Design a protein around this ligand. Structure first.
Ligand SMILES: CCCCCCCCCC(=O)O
Lengths: 257, 9
C-alpha cells in the first residue's frame, strides 16, 4: 500500500505540473471564492461581441476557438501521460495509439472540472460561457456541448478532487483495448497497478462514498459513449458545412478512429 | 505523426 500512495502522490504532482487550471482553482472561480477575476460572462450575442477579446458566423467562430483549446489540452495531456511510470518505455507506436484513442475521454473528464449546471469556464478561467447560450447555437453546433454538461453534472456529484482525478485520468490513458495496440500486456500491467492505486485513493479520501470505485469504472464506459456521439456530430459537420476543416493535430486524432 | 513528435520532445 505504501508504494500505491507514493504512486498516487507522484501522479498528483505531475498533474499539477501539466495542467495549469486545476479543479481546485476552477471551483474557486466558479463559486466566487478567489481574490482576482471574476470571469467575463458570455450569455448572448451581444456579450459574446463585448467579450470576444478573451480570448464567419458565430457558431463557426466558437467551434474554431474550441478546436484550439482542444489542441492545447492534447499537448497538456501528452505531457502528463509521459509522467506516468512505464509509459515512455512502451513501444512508441503504442504510446501514439493510447493518446489517439484516449485524449478526448480525458478532455471531457477535465472539462467537467470547469463546468457547473449553468455554464463553463473558458480561456483559463477568464470567461464563462452559459449552457443556455451554447444550446441556442444553430444545429448541429448547439448539440455539441449539452451531452458534456449532462455528463459533468452527474460526474461532479461524485465530488472528486484533483488527487483522485490524477489517478482516474492515468487509468483511462493506459487502456489495453484500444484498436491496433502491438503489445497489450505491459499496458495492462501498468493499468492494473493504477487501478489498485485508484481503489486505495478512493477508500482513504472518500471513506463514506460506498461503491465510488465501481461508479468511476462506469464513468469510464460513459466517456466512451460521449466520444462516440461526438464523432457522429463531427461527421454531420463534415457532410454539411463546406467551410470547415479540423486543425492538423485533430485531423490525426480523428483519422478513421 | 504529430502525436509522435509531441511524445518525443
Ligand atoms: C460551437 C459549439 C462548440 C462545440 C465545439 C466542439 C469542439 C470539438 C473539437 C474536438 O473534437 O477536439
Amino acid at each position: 500500500s505504501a508504494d500505491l500512495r507514493a504512486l498516487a502522490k507522484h501522479l498528483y504532482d505531475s498533474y499539477i505540473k501539466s495542467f495549469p487550471l486545476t479543479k481546485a482553482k476552477a471551483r474557486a472561480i466558479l463559486t466566487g471564492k478567489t481574490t482576482d477575476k471574476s470571469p467575463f460572462v458570455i450569455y448572448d450575442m451581444n456579450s459574446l461581441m463585448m467579450g470576444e477579446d478573451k480570448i464567419k458566423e458565430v457558431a463557426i467562430r466558437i467551434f474554431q476557438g474550441c478546436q484550439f483549446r482542444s489542441v492545447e489540452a492534447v499537448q497538456e495531456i501528452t505531457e502528463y501521460a509521459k509522467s506516468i511510470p512505464g509509459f515512455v518505455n512502451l513501444d512508441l507506436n503504442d504510446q501514439v495509439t493510447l493518446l489517439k484513442y484516449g485524449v478526448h475521454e480525458i478532455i471531457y473528464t477535465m472539462l467537467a472540472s470547469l463546468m457547473n449546471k449553468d455554464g463553463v469556464l473558458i480561456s483559463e478561467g477568464q470567461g464563462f460561457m452559459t449552457r443556455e447560450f451554447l444550446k441556442s447555437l444553430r444545429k448541429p453546433f448547439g448539440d455539441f456541448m449539452e451531452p458534456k454538461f449532462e455528463f459533468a453534472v452527474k460526474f461532479n456529484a461524485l465530488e472528486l478532487d484533483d488527487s483522485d482525478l490524477a489517478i482516474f485520468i492515468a487509468v483511462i490513458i493506459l487502456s489495453g483495448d484500444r484498436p491496433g495496440l502491438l503489445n497489450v500486456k505491459p499496458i495492462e500491467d501498468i493499468q492494473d497497478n493504477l487501478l489498485q492505486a485508484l481503489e486505495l485513493q478512493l477508500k482513504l479520501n472518500h471513506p463514506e462514498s460506498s461503491q465510488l470505485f465501481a461508479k468511476l469504472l462506469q464513468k469510464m464506459t460513459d466517456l466512451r459513449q460521449i466520444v462516440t456521439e461526438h464523432v457522429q456530430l463531427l461527421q454531420v459537420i463534415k457532410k454539411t458545412e463546406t467551410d470547415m476543416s479540423l486543425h492538423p493535430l485533430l485531423q490525426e486524432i480523428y483519422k478513421d478512429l | 505523426s504529430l502525436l509522435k513528435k509531441l511524445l518525443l520532445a
